[model samples]
Target chain A: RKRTFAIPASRLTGRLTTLKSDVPAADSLFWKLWNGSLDTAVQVLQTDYFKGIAAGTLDPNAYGSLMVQDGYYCFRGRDDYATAATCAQDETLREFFKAKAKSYDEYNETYHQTWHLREASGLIPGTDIKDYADYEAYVAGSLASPYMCVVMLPCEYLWPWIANFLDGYTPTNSLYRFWIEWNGGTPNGAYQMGNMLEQYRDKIDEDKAVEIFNTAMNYELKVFTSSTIL
Target chain B: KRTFAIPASRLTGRLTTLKSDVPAADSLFWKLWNGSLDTAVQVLQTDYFKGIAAGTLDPNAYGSLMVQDGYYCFRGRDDYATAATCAQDETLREFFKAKAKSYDEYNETYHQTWHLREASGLIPGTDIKDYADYEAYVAGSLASPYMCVVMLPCEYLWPWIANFLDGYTPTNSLYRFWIEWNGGTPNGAYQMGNMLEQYRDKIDEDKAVEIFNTAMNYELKVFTSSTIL
Candidate 1:
């Protein structure tokens, strides 16, 4: 993505003035993070993991493993919301996190039972997911609330996009339908989180935020790939 | 005793307050905070807080008080984690877990500011009813919501004090840091208020109200603070 010549800030501003700019700055900041990671994000869709998911041919063994890792990711990740909540400076933000943490419990209890893979015999889990948890912890431990939100948005943002991207349901491709029906709706929380992130926009390091967002996208791809791997 | 301002929590943010307004107040948290109106004001009345506002409190006293607060920070973090153990509801359980993590970070900041040890254990000061109330919440049943009610004042009261002291605090004042530091904003009191109201059904209305008011009373009572256990 290189321009033959540098576009000066004033020139850029003038161009936007001449053009219709639909995205607000705050919304743009979120899309900036999302767009920056599109390359990896798209590659995720092309992976065998996603292909299997879409094709209804996801290996039973692989599905089992993914469910286990997801369960781990889910169970292990419950505290992430609170950790982020605890870090919150604003009341609504803290409530958001606590509520999300509580929501996670609801999602975990209900969703995992539907999968029924955690109890499947002779199953092995992935280091990638554990490492994934590490990344989440690293950011939560080292960064600000915005960075935490940045790290979290992908998990919410990607799946719905993935579910919608596939258009599989519209089968026991119904398994994937759960993905669609459950995740297909707009992620208002993600959007709200993104919208709220602008509050700290002045304080956020745009570069770091992008880096974290891209990394989470990598985890998304890796998590799917882990499914098809072993 | 009373707050100058709450140092905000670090990790969670929608940044609504900074970008916009901290939404409006909620009934439960409003009731909780309002119930302690006397206590909130009383904290201002405390010699401990007054000295800070007047810039007359000994820095040593401030430091000593900081230590006490540090211990409460530790205790608060522990109670969240500990309460989670006895938590039966999935939501409350996880909420407690993450809250524990959040409180852990708060404690870290508290200790870092004091240059104290993060490894420090809870040192109970019986005379400090504020801390004692926290310990008592998890005493037997491990009521996470009860613990939450007890913990309410710590989050809600500080900024109230900080806000009231706003015009009086100045840069030249030794304790101006109290106002400037804790007074940055309401520190999300209304957020927790709404949350408490949301979970109002989970906790006993009578007990919660009393527990909250009790904590507020202790908040007022702590003005009688003495240095060290």
Candidate 2:
């Protein structure tokens, strides 16, 4: 008789209901910006794409398109992190950003492979791609900005909120699980940066901080909106 | 006291006579590419490459390559982004953006393999000269019809050099991985060459050739420095 082995259990296997409270504090500057952007955020959450994903009615083709775009965005994020890593004064922060950059790149490649989304010539560039390129250009150009850490927080935080919104809901489509699970789960790094941002809160001018925050939030909204428009 | 922060100049309305000299589609690409083919082949004959093939290459040399290559990718992508803004054709803009992202992917790999923790601050050496030349070329490309020519070496040369070392397996996995993604497969170079050809007919012939030669010289110097740097 052959011996059989049992599967192991995970701490994260159970229901997770406390994400909202677990996220950044309500009185935090990050939250203030997030709250101010609720109007646009609501618009994003209501997009046909998000709704379709929630209801398991999304076309696989549309989901693939969105994944491809998101994968590319991850690459852009990787590059931004690379820049930050190279320029970081703190040794630990530099390593953190470098590690994230590598992991994000792996995520991008895995996304491409999982979806079988090969890059064929003559494919029309997505509006989302251009938007991402624009944001990355701004980041590359503004390497001198002291608020770079804070500027990067909005996009990082937006995903978890969406995941939290759909936490308990399961879609019939298997593909939806990937997006929900990854984004819905806790991102300790984002919160860590949120705390770091507090240290430099009074460093950047309030008006400049608000401008950068709003711009990033607007980009996040536009990214979700692009999937639906496609 | 001057710095890299000086805004790259735009050559929007500069000249006219050179426009009529633009060659037929794909003609300039082949001319410049074929012109440098000999030197590219000669690159394979160098002891630096023989060392890699024999697995006797200095690890430090390979490390320097990774560091310098990462730095180049960062600056290269910035140039491509600028070129996208300057592009008149929608497809060209799209292509430039995509290519810029490709460099980002390459840099990410380098960072991962080296655990590259610190940025090497600017130094007064061959590396500085290399970066300065490319910077000047990027500004010139934006100001003239020479962008594609100015970009040819960076896009095509390394992959071409990698092709020459295709069969040899490096002892260092990091070095091997770099070669595999860059030159072990032909896809990247092919894509870039196609992109280059697309713009060849649109630019001035004389200016394009000039830019191509200058870039090719920089390419040779880069390979030479890699051997002993």
Candidate 3:
């Protein structure tokens, strides 16, 4: 896909001109990763855990444990983004990282209290949970700002996709309903963050970019898979 | 007129302050695998190898394992190359560059032994579940010293585990070859292990430990992931 951006060549002239026709689509890489995960996404939807959540058969204790784990994960994300803010080179980008970090903290608190998950705070993650945590730590500590988006954007994009997948489900349990509603609804912020990711794609090499993108997708698969059936 | 330039004296003073924190700590690589290394080896001492020896393990499972490991060898080469690029010291660079070539050869060995066409059924089950995310981290973030940390468990854990299976002969030739291929840390691997610890020593010990543990945790899951189902 190709598009041309028209901008005034000189501020003094104040005339629009087509820059070029060969500027690659900003969201091309993001879409490629997303498309690749669709089968995985579908596989996750079919799992027993999601089915149980949809049917309200999930044990509250198990559900509560998941909430605690998620709250901790969100806190970790906030910490990561804070680091990103410090490592960011541009003033505007730094502000974006800072803002997202704060938003993640807010989400972490909301989930932490919503499910009364404080008691489960100190327990170590095992199996796929640990896998997701390692992936996040690796991303936060190692990835630079441009590459960071490749790892971070999937969380935003996939929730809405999951919500869409469960379009007709009427949850019997209040907790399950809340969970679905929170994740199912798409927000403009998510898409904006996605677009921002596209803008920064050039900062990293293509092979590394693909790896980051694929890693994010795999984490999504693991998270959903682990949270649900097994 | 205002300028963004700062005084050199102030910058130099800041550098001096940064250098003083945490003078020494243990290598992250050691802290992660040394304690857990035995348990990982013990897993091989049990059903994983016993099944291979007796031919009780499903042939499909054995085939699947080879295909997945083969795929990892291909990806591992890139990761080692990236690590080589990020190495600050000349010797560390040399070590990782050598590793890159070694992994390339390992990939070739797997290809010659196991047909990629045989790998078709193996993919949809295990590859997406295990390799994708794990290799992604190794492949994507090699610029960080933590890259070396993540790579350590896979490097150090496999050979020891494979070597444990040496006492028992596998009924299947492919199974025997698989065990023989992995069975021992050669001189090169030991040198890489030393390099990993050295690299970890150069960075913040806590961060390196955290990265090491994370990778260790992933490896634990991976090694024990096989099921009869």
Candidate 4:
């Protein structure tokens, strides 16, 4: 129940970097999974959206429209997390999904509006978010506890590296301040999902795990490029 | 690493003389377990459970009693729920609810984890003596407190054995999950002990000794009843 407030970008960077080294990563099971997936997927940062955001040159129109398109994914992601909450047997994992769902709601209510994201009166048809919605639902529905964590690892973990790579995009950059810090600091959920994956790795059948992971990474990369394109 | 029985005379000696150093440790549940601690130590060493400690036991030997024990766990699941219903205090009420999950999950998850034959659908009656005494405790009017007293010994003992055997188990022992499952010292057991103290008067002193002894005795009896041991 610790509330996170915005920190100075330099402090946030230092803090997040320390957390990167501190949390059992690198050799850890899901860290390897994260690395392995990154090896296979198109780099979201290499995409024009992040490149522009990092350079303070991405069109505000593109970033705003990218966020507008993302609302569908966030809403659908919220539902999948709620679905996972129903399916989780362990208390930690159950609460993790519940917290994830609330965070999705929080993002839609407060954060997404930063880009002045238009509220959809109905489901948008031109969105690239639909493919990701179905994929996330499938992952959350499958096994739904420890195993659901694999698909989610890409999305949760992707941002911190991007934020770091952006060098927190100059401290005075209000356009990206919250985005970088939100991704950077207090990576509690990502750490939790990975730890859950590590904890239950043995007894659960991990068949198709690489394939599942490969596809999840594919979708994360796909959504960014599709939504961010001109 | 070492296997030896607590002498029958030694177990008898602690029946009245067991002393508690901590205030919370003075409760009926804690008293019985601390008194019977050596008895629990010996039970784990009784060839059957000792193998689990040292990773020397075969899966065939290990799976034998899990069938019977799962039977105990099956009926024991409802006992804690019934106790929770009987409880008026919120802390004690939730305590029973959490303990109920421990028993409930043993059936849902742990039974398969041990790679044993399922005990729930197996023909009953053979393991009825131990099951009957536990049921009898739950059947009584003071089922909440009495049930806690009876169940606490087994709750406390497994972790005691796990922690005791911690030094003895290999880093990758065949039965390492046994230690992992029950590794910490007396968490649930500590809850039961303090929780029972408030309801002490609801249960008679003599009934307390009988119920506590009945549960503690059955723990070792089941190990000795093991097919391989």
Candidate 5:
């Protein structure tokens, strides 16, 4: 829940490398969270997080932003940036998003009030910690800073839309091939980073998993200008 | 194997009961032998005679021929007529003789060839047992007043094996005591008699099982046919 701002331009220009454990942890955790289904994703949001979102104890804006950010990362990491290109090329993206797009707004106005993630930021809630003089360190400390790189990319439904189209046209459309490599590439990089972390850190250690996730956040930030871009 | 005497008065009555009870078969000897078991045959063999011939071994209790032959102690009222009747043309004696010879042949072929000792005497003993030691000992030792296999001579070895393999208890004594190889109980003796009588003429375990399974399958056939009807 930390927040970051005012980073230097140089870090954003670098390639995303050495993020964290390149191997993702979902499948191992899947067997634990559910017998063997994607149902746990629904359960986490609907039951576990919904209570906070519905109670109005949390701010709606911050919670809504995190959902978009998290959803973008999840979708991008699985599919890739070529999807965005495909989505850009056709109305199909609109159809797909149209169906799911309604739910996002409905959730924000009513639900985000109960589970605002911003309120959970330790620094925002407390003033005891001394403010850092170094802006880089400050952003590094901020929870939102890591997500800043992937924050703006239309990687959500857009990438999926593009990837489907690319699958049909990648053989001939070198431009689509170029766009996919440019946008959708980080997740695969993120995965490799995760694998590196796993190798050095006892192979998917929980503490190392957190480190890997943070590294992915830092890596994404280095590549893309905002968290929305991921 | 052992021979016992029934009182002269009880013999005809018991014979009549057996004739009425056993199933009709291809062989009359078997039919008579088998039919005899349904009722008075078991009674006649398993100490029934001992009970009927109760009291002293006197000439008055036996037919006159037995009395003359020194086989029985008691003579009948019509001792002369009874003596003639006893020795006259009868299938029972001949059946017994043939049965004995057949049993000996079976014993040699299966028991002797296979070298199955009395189960109790086997080292550590066979865990697979259908009956108790006494009956096993009895089955092992029984060299009888001839054995009946379908009223002919029994081929003991193979048939016994066949029954054992198919889950028949050799020691269960019932009306068909001699015919069945039941796990022995009080009822075992009769079952032994029935089994012996049925298999006395049997050639081998395979053949006996073939026949026995065929007969037993009738139950299944009836069940199926009844459903169709």
Candidate 6:
């Protein structure tokens, strides 16, 4: 429909030269690429492919759901929360893995402790959050809904989903945290706050919901606090 | 006015990036089919393409068009840009060389600039002028417009879209000011929602208009793009 006009060689050359001269090698690379991705990415946002699937775009007569899972995969063995395999070989773990180990299991222990607290407190797998069955049902309904089409926002969907899984739930494991972090998302990621915050805002508002969120926050805070200790 | 045609698949092959393989149904490496091209031209009108042909859109900005090689290329954000510049630098003489090639290449497809009708110049070897002119021609035609589309690979797209729209036509900018503003993925109405919430205090009617228009522009462009891919 529209044709691209060409710049005069002189002007083109001048612009390219000036752009190169003004931009540092690495910085230039970042700017151009970011600009391009930003543009294309924005364009994708315009598509029905994206609008049709997002929860925010379409309302429903019945509830539909999608679940994200996340967790960690540890690199080193630690005494308090070492995997059974970690404890198996002393010399191998001691000489190599031992040096690699941390005094504490950074994410794992806190999550385990938090999950225990949640279970003790009756804050999860119940009110404020759906049970596994309900979770499955919601996902199925959403997928099957005539009004719905699923669009995986992230390039690699699995890892991010895993992260959501671990972060949403109380317990953290090496495998779980790995999923979350791999998506380049931080543990500090939004918790149903802002726009999404509202959708999920009421979620953790009940006593049980508060318990779950507070507990997760507590574990995360502990991790931050522990980092200070080290 | 008449149907616009090209070896669309050939162009798409070249536009396709390295991040993934060329798909048969919705491959990025395909040119806009004649029907869809006419539709975009009809919708946007020819002045747009003429502007593009006449250098109103600036070929320099075309360099800003982004293409993603499939993930395997490991061409992170920087790499993607670099690769594009490299292609531009290589075929500086042939404006559409990379673009046409991009539509056909499977392992390495790249997105040509947006709104081919409103933003492109030179339709192979015709008097198509630039993108704006093409739009004009399409507008004068009797046939219904057929939109174009394309598929891309991206992650963390919402954050990306937020940054793009906010900066592109800062609420104050004028050109195409009343265009649609996309929230990264179409599904990412969350970002738009977040935008409204985060900047509700700052978003006035004009600002809202700008955002909404920008989003619409993006949607209209995507419709045009889909036909090409």
Please provide TM-scores, in order, for all candidate models, with all chains considered together. 0.43, 0.42, 0.42, 0.42, 0.16, 0.20
In terms of TM-score, which candidate is stronger, 4 or 5? 4
Cα lDDT of model 6 by residue, A77-163, tens digit: 132122322442323222222221332234334435533321222322222222222332332233221100011111222223223
Instruction: Calculate DockQ per candidate and list them.
Output: 0.01, 0.01, 0.01, 0.01, 0.01, 0.02
Task: Single out the weakest 10-residue window by summed lDDT for candidate 3 chain A.
Answer: A1-10
Q: Rank the candidates by lDDT, best first.
A: 4, 1, 3, 2, 5, 6
Distance from true position, residue A186, model 6, in Å?
A: 14
Candidate 6 docking category?
A: incorrect
Worst 10 residues of 4 chain B by lDDT: B1-10
Candidate 4 chain B superposition, TM-score:
0.74
Among incorrect, acceptable, medium and high, the docking class of model 1 is: incorrect
Question: Deviation in angstroms for A120 in model 1?
Answer: 52
Scored by DockQ, the top model is 6
Pairs with steric clashes in candidate 3: A163-A184
Q: Which residue runs does candidate 4 get wrong by more than 4 Å?
A: A1-22, A40-42, A90-92, A111-121, A125-127, A168-178, B1-229
Best-performing candidate as measured by lDDT: 4
**lDDT value, residue B174 of candidate 3:** 49
In candidate 3, what are the lDDT values of residues A1-230, reduced to their tens digit?
00101111231121112222132354477665565455455555555556556556667766766666766666667777888888888665576676667666655566556655453246566466667666766776676777766677667676666665454443435456665666665444455555556666677686877777677777777766577443
Residue B76 in model 3: lDDT: 68
Per-residue alpha-carbon lDDT of model 5 for A102-192, expressed as tens digits? 3233333322344433212221211111111122122223423222112221222223322332232232333224333433323432243
Task: Give the fraction of reference interface contacts each candidate recovers.
Answer: 0.00, 0.00, 0.00, 0.00, 0.00, 0.00
For model 4, chain A alone compared with the true chain A gives a TM-score of: 0.75
Q: Which ten residues in a row have the lowest lDDT in candidate 3 chain B?
A: B1-10
